[PDB]
Symmetry: C3
Subunit: 139 residues, 3 copies
Amino acid sequence: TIIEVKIKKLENFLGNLPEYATEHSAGMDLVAANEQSITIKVGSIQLIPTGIAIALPESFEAQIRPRSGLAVKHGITVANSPGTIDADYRGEIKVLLINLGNKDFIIEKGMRIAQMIIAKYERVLWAETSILTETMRGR
Amino acid sequence: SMTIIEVKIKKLENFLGNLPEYATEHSAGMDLVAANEQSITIKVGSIQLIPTGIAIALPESFEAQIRPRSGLAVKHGITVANSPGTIDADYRGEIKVLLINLGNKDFIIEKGMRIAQMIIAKYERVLWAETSILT
Amino acid sequence: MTIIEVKIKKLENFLGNLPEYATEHSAGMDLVAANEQSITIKVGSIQLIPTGIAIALPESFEAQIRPRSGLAVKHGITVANSPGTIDADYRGEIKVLLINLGNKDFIIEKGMRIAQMIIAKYERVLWAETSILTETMRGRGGFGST
Ligand SMILES: O=c1ccn([C@H]2C[C@H](O)[C@@H](COP(=O)(O)O)O2)c(=O)[nH]1
Ligand SMILES: O=c1ccn([C@H]2C[C@H](O)[C@@H](COP(=O)(O)O)O2)c(=O)[nH]1
Ligand SMILES: O=c1ccn([C@H]2C[C@H](O)[C@@H](COP(=O)(O)O)O2)c(=O)[nH]1
């Protein structure tokens, strides 16, 4: 199942629109679009802009997830993972990276920093009740 | 088209105010609100479990995901330690949010603070097919 | 509910039971450590733990590697690249990247439950490049908004 998503390139965008590595990949690589280098000191969190804004169709969301390689090699991961991009968000997509490694890490424009996976969500209608069914799991 | 799924929800004794709400009509998730009666300090490097005051019964083939909110992470280094937390359709206990302070100042969690977002989605039940060669 | 068949290969270090759902309505299966030498995760360190299985997902399905809440609560151990993303293109050994954000060193021994694996559908995006996106209510009137 294919979904069309509108996407706007911002002033800082470069290159191809976010790409899937292979034809069956779940996620697109997000690329740092910071106009000046950003150093993430050990233990710190930095916001990295991506230079895109998107308009997801109704009932969909985008998830900002880590690239395993950055975590393995440098202890860099997504601080709010999985980051939720809502279908009515019209701002620049931002990636929050934390440095949990042992050396300061420089984020340069063009680096692959996260992946973005699009998935369906369901909107909840609450049915308030005073008792829930019992299950084999329980409380 | 969005689709609606009805989910049963029980208020526990420590719930205050309103059932979890979508910030906007097109939000993927509902905001989860701290329901601790007494403030909870999360010191630098600590993990703390925060109650929400609710229990839910998801319909079959659905799960709920406990995810961080952007503000707590970027402003305070607070995030969800077991993210994304998985709420199973047969869980009948209180939903709790496990926060970690990876920032550089102690942070006090007060009743009423938005501490996470909860996204409901379908999952698929796997039947394994054992094989000797993956194509 | 909806059942999906997934092919799975036992590698040489596989010990015993294929990943199982803890209950008939659990979203995820428990993944178990299959390391043939003990692995110590020092405080603040990150270690890759093998599971001894490889899988072949059907198209449009992913497996998400997520933390078990018990390990996080009791030991500060969680999944460093969470949610780990397994898709149809990955037929190698499933590995769990753990980080120790607790207050003492933690030894991973084979047979320990280390993560849970939730299979779900994802969508493939085709981009419609545009110069004007619709306006919405989100963030409207906030400080600094243009
Ligand atoms: O990693 C993230 C998370 C969120 N957002 C955007 C899209 C969301 O709709 C909006 C609000 O996020 P929350 O505060 O609800 O997490 O910020 C990002 O750009 N990056
Ligand atoms: O962030 C979380 C994760 C889990 N749970 C509840 C619902 C789950 O069904 C149950 C068991 O979680 P695990 O041990 O499978 O992580 O705990 C929560 O309240 N919050
Ligand atoms: O928790 C994880 C995440 C990924 N992978 C597999 C599937 C991916 O295709 C491959 C490389 O990881 P990424 O660089 O795409 O994150 O490793 C795992 O074994 N476990």
